[PDB]
Ligand binder design. Structure first.
Ligand SMILES: *[C@H](C)[C@H]1/C(=C/c2[nH]c(/C=C3N=C(/C=C4\NC(=O)C(CC)=C4C)C(C)=C\3CCC(=O)O)c(CCC(=O)O)c2C)NC(=O)[C@@H]1C
Ligand SMILES: *[C@H](C)[C@H]1/C(=C/c2[nH]c(/C=C3N=C(/C=C4\NC(=O)C(CC)=C4C)C(C)=C\3CCC(=O)O)c(CCC(=O)O)c2C)NC(=O)[C@@H]1C
Lengths: 158, 158
């Protein structure tokens, strides 16, 4: 619950600061598949989280094959319009499925590890992401990873 | 000053908890030489820090050649009596110079990086370091590294 509070605080903060439509926290599994573990979403949009607090699966073969991809280097990806990005069909279909028109996705490092990703999404319109927003999100994610690691340090020692 | 407060808090905490004679924070330079940047020492012992707040040089060729040595793996070294440890003369002479009879030295990780070391020292007598003290110091150091990284995140972004 203490972790969910941290995810909720960060995700709502992002959504508030960037005035995006949806924020997602995605956590990598050991095999580099991953799970959504938090969503902040404006009420006008169908939420990804169902009433059991389950999420849908995004089975991203590319992240998994590349063991986190660019995010291993602490890089982000900002895409203003998914429909003009030249993506592979299976990837675009998931973007469409999750009502992602434009996204800014940054890595979450927990100590030395690429623990997950933090995504900010625009749902109804493309969005030209500014350099400052990319830099800000990256900082928010670093802060989130520190919060996560701090919580782990306290939760499991004494 | 905000960093010195963190070093002072941690170092005094260690010295208090382990009832050792001296605690040192050592920070690695880019070339894996290093500098002492804080000491907590019981009043009975000559301090390493002079009145200018300068420290003496410990020019450890082995740490430097091995780019941090065992500490890169997050390992510690606990030595109960330096005089029976089989050390190389140049290393033993520095131990003697700094009035180190027994030491417990752990790595300080700042995010993904081996930033430095945290050392607890007994000055006047050997000391059998217990597994629990090794495990505790390791945790204190992880916490210190998190504090350091958090301070860096806040100091240099906005
Ligand atoms: C095809 C069978 C499947 C597929 C392929 C695929 N993915 C990518 C690139 C990425 N996939 C993602 C994943 C996410 N973005 C997010 O916002 C979230 C939630 C936080 C996830 C899980 C990301 C970020 C990228 C860019 C990665 C990078 O290192 O640059 C590719 C490469 C680009 C392309 O489309 O050609 C491919 C082929 N993804 C699926 O979902 C399919 C089922
Ligand atoms: C010889 C010219 C010089 C030298 C050699 C040397 N050092 C080591 C091993 C270590 N040196 C240290 C350093 C410290 N211990 C501390 O508590 C602090 C302050 C925080 C420092 C800087 C450490 C921890 C080790 C163990 C490292 C590891 O990876 O295990 C060796 C190897 C062991 C040996 O003595 O044979 C050698 C040869 N050190 C000097 O100071 C000389 C000038």
């Amino acid at each position: 619950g203490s972790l969910q509070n941290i995810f909720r605080a960060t995700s709502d903060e992002v959504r508030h600061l960037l005035s995006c439509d949806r924020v997602l926290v995605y956590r990598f599994n050991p095999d580099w598949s991953g799970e959504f573990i938090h969503e902040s979403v404006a009420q006008m949009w169908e939420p990804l989280k169902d009433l059991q607090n389950n999420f849908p699966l995004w089975q991203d073969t590319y992240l998994q094959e590349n063991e986190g991809g660019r995010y291993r280097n602490h890089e982000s990806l900002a895409v203003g319009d998914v429909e003009t990005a030249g993506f592979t069909d299976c990837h675009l279909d998931n973007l469409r499925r999750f009502e992602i028109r434009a996204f800014l996705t940054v890595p979450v490092f927990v100590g030395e590890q690429l623990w997950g990703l933090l995504g900010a999404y625009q749902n109804g319109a493309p969005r030209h992401w500014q350099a400052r927003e990319i830099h800000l999100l990256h900082q928010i994610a670093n802060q989130l990873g520190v919060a996560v690691y701090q919580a782990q340090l306290l939760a499991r020692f004494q």
